[PDB]
């Protein structure tokens, strides 16, 4: 009896650590661990008591449809005889060009676009083959 009891206590100790991590990362904070707080994009968690433990209610965002945009890997710009590239400073954002030919940035988790500005770009020495050529019309808003 004692051996079986001690074995189960070790088992539960491990599941307690998991319950504790779930409270601290899903309920008391906003976790950056993909897939941890349920299947989907985590929004918030609530909890209830249960016999010998607890119940977690993971509220997640579920997409029903996707928006297509035309993305750019970077922008190729020039001033006089000097050519250089501009790339997005924040690697988590997608750069795309709107119907107004203006540059926008959007996070990949939700279609929440904002106009791009100069502080969002990093200037580097060259341009890749997938870069889009900038014109005088765009330059004042991106440099």
């Amino acid at each position: 009896f004692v051996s079986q009891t001690l074995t189960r206590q070790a088992e539960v100790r491990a599941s307690r650590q998991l319950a504790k991590d779930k409270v601290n990362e899903c309920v008391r904070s906003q976790s950056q661990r993909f897939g941890f707080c349920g299947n989907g994009t985590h929004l918030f968690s609530l909890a209830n008591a249960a016999p010998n433990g607890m119940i977690f209610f993971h509220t997640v965002l579920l997409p029903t449809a996707y928006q297509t945009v035309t993305a750019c890997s970077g922008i190729c710009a020039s001033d006089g005889d000097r050519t250089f590239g501009l790339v997005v400073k924040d690697v988590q954002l997608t750069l795309f060009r709107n119907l107004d030919d203006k540059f926008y940035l959007t996070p990949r988790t939700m279609y929440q676009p904002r106009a791009a500005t100069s502080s969002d770009f990093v200037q580097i020495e060259g341009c890749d083959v997938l870069f889009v050529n900038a014109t005088e019309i765009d330059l004042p808003s991106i440099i």
Partner: protein, 547 residues
């Protein structure tokens, strides 16, 4: 109604038990009627029935409030019992509270006690056991017929008499009372009894694919010379009466073995085959030990031999038990075990003598009932080179050069060789395990290895690793209720196979061409349980071990 027990009583809980809950006949008694009749177990009349099942009755139940209103037409006598010796016993209450006694000729044999003011049930089994409120308070000799004449008279109370038989059932008890009875009489009810559950949850349950009983016997033994001996053991029983009149079997009873080597004291099998019989002779005597009278009345006795300390029974020596040596003796010198020789009478069986056995396990000598009879392609009770069991024996086209027989890791026989031509036979079980698919309290199908009808299921289909029997009309696109792995079973018994969940896919960190960004959102709530703590138990070691 109460459960019948020989010892302690269950206050609450579910138990599978053998109880007289089958009703052959129910005889209700009106408020002002005399329940007077004569009942016999071995062929009841069944004329007063409220469905009637015509069979032998095991128990008669009197379900009435034996208050101070219940009177008998026989006066003091409540019951009159006709037992197997032609003997009449009476159960009677007197007012010198009503005190019940067991009587024979007019004198009292036992005092049972007074009747409690709270008696709701009396059951009399044919083996003489009397149950009051479920408890076996007293017993008599086996009963053939019970006479009774019971009435509540002017009280205007009603009651019933039930004629019942024993069966296995799952019974739910609460406060020492029956609340629910489920009979173990169907394919679904057998699962309920096995699971101690009157209401099964949806799922799969292990069952036997079939039952067996009544088979041919198959015997395979290595060839030898036919050399058969009949061994006639004669037992002369000495019977005398004791002061109470019951029989006593004398220690002076004699055992005579067949004669061997002039002397008789000892006898040995010196043949290849043999059969042993016991011939019973009875003589009676007075008290001077003069066994010159015939046995009659009660001093009638049959000589029988019991097992005693031997790893075999005397009566089974006529099967196909084998030995290298086997001797009987009337003197314990070299004996390996002994048999108990007894005088069996109408009731009591008592030991008079011991018979000593000397033996060595082996195969030179075989007992016989009067061989190599093998029954193929059918279920048989076999004895093959000393290995016994039940199964189906088939001829195979395999070849194994070495050995006589082959067994499994569990010790079971898997096959054997015919020494006359090298043919290999395989041996398989007549019945196998199967998984019954149970949905909403019914069997809708089953998983089996044998292509044979089971559990009342007649329709079937063949899948890659099993046969599936069902209620579904087999010669589906339905939702499964119960599932394991990729196998699901639908409400209508249909079997379906289950794929793996599909999704659109993960959004990748691509910013190079056309890309899709999740846009239109809703809410999904997922629920999970995690165990945090156990319920600790503190044990007092000394008290647990030493109460």
């Amino acid at each position: 109604w109460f459960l019948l027990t020989n010892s302690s009583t269950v206050v609450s809980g579910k138990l599978v038990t053998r109880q007289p809950l089958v009703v052959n006949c129910l005889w209700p008694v009106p408020s002002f009627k005399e329940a007077a009749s004569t009942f016999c177990f071995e062929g009841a009349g069944f004329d007063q029935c409220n469905a009637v099942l015509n069979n032998t009755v095991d128990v008669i139940r009197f379900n009435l409030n034996f208050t101070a209103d219940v009177q008998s037409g026989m006066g003091a006598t409540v019951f009159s019992l006709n037992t197997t010796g032609g003997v009449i016993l009476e159960i009677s209450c007197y007012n010198d509270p009503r005190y019940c006694y067991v009587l024979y000729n007019g004198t009292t044999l036992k005092y049972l006690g007074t009747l409690p003011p709270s008696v709701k049930e009396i059951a009399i089994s044919k083996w003489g056991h009397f149950y009051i409120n479920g408890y076996n308070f007293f017993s008599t000799f086996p009963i053939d017929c019970i006479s009774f004449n019971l009435t509540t008279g002017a009280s205007g109370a009603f009651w019933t008499i039930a004629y019942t038989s024993y069966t296995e059932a799952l019974v739910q008890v609460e406060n020492t009372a029956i609340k629910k009875v489920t009979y173990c009489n169907s394919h679904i009810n057998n699962i309920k009894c096995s699971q101690l559950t009157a209401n099964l949850q949806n799922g799969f349950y292990p069952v036997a694919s079939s039952e067996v009983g009544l088979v041919n016997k198959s015997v395979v033994l290595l060839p030898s010379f036919f050399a058969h001996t009949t061994v006639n053991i004669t037992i002369d029983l000495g019977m005398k009466r004791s002061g109470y009149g019951q029989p006593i079997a004398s220690p002076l009873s004699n055992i005579t073995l067949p004669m061997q080597d002039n002397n008789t004291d000892v006898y040995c099998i010196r043949s290849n085959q043999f059969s042993i019989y016991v011939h019973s002779t009875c003589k009676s005597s007075l008290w001077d030990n003069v066994f010159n009278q015939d046995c009659t009345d009660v001093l009638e006795a049959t000589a029988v031999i019991k097992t005693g300390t031997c790893p075999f029974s005397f009566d089974k020596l006529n099967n196909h038990l084998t030995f290298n040596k086997f001797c009987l003796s009337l003197s314990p010198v070299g004996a390996n075990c002994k048999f108990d020789v007894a005088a069996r009478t109408r009731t009591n069986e008592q030991v008079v003598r011991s018979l000593y056995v000397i033996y060595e396990e082996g195969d030179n000598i075989v007992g016989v009932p009067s061989l190599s009879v093998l029954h193929l392609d059918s279920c048989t009770d076999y004895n093959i080179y000393g290995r016994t069991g039940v199964g189906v024996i088939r001829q195979t086209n395999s070849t194994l050069l070495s050995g006589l027989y082959y067994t499994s890791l569990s010790g079971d026989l898997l096959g054997f060789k015919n020494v006359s031509d090298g043919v290999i036979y395989s041996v398989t079980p007549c019945d196998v395990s199967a998984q019954a698919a149970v949905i909403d309290g019914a069997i809708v199908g089953a998983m089996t290895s044998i292509n044979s009808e089971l559990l009342g299921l007649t329709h079937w289909t063949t899948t890659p690793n099993f046969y599936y029997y069902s209620i579904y009309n087999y010669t589906v696109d339905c939702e499964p209720i119960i599932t394991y792995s990729n196998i699901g079973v639908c409400k209508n018994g249909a079997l379906v196979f289950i794929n793996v969940t599909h999704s659109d896919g993960d959004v990748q960190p691509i910013s190079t061409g056309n890309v899709t960004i999740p846009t239109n959102f809703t809410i999904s709530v997922q629920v999970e349980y995690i165990q945090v703590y156990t319920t600790p138990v503190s044990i007092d070691c000394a008290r647990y071990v030493c109460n």
